[PDB]
Design a protein around this motif. Structure first.
Motif, short mmCIF file in Angstrom:
data_model
loop_
_atom_site.label_atom_id
_atom_site.label_comp_id
_atom_site.label_asym_id
_atom_site.label_seq_id
_atom_site.Cartn_x
_atom_site.Cartn_y
_atom_site.Cartn_z
N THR A 8 4.28 -2.94 -3.29
CA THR A 8 4.32 -4.40 -3.57
C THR A 8 5.26 -4.95 -4.60
O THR A 8 4.85 -5.01 -5.70
CB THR A 8 2.78 -4.26 -4.18
N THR A 15 4.29 -3.28 3.30
CA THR A 15 3.96 -1.92 3.77
C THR A 15 2.51 -1.49 3.44
O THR A 15 1.65 -1.51 4.24
CB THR A 15 5.09 -0.96 2.88
N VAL A 16 2.19 -1.44 1.97
CA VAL A 16 1.04 -1.13 1.51
C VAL A 16 0.30 -2.57 1.27
O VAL A 16 -0.40 -2.57 0.49
CB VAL A 16 1.04 -0.40 0.39
N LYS A 17 0.58 -3.66 2.28
CA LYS A 17 0.01 -4.81 2.00
C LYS A 17 -1.43 -4.91 2.13
O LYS A 17 -2.13 -5.82 1.84
CB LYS A 17 0.43 -5.69 3.19
N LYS A 18 -2.18 -3.78 2.41
CA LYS A 18 -3.32 -3.67 2.66
C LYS A 18 -4.17 -4.20 1.28
O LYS A 18 -5.10 -5.00 1.43
CB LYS A 18 -3.75 -2.16 2.69
#
Ligand SMILES: [Hg+2]
Length: 18
Positions: A8, A15-18
């Motif tokens: 982030t 990518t790890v926008k989760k």
């Protein structure tokens, strides 16, 4: 080095926008 503990950063928040 590639992915890192955090992500982030106007770089992979998608990518790890989760
Ligand atoms: Hg990132």
């Amino acid at each position: 080095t590639l992915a890192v503990p955090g992500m982030t950063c106007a770089a992979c928040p998608i990518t790890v926008k989760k």
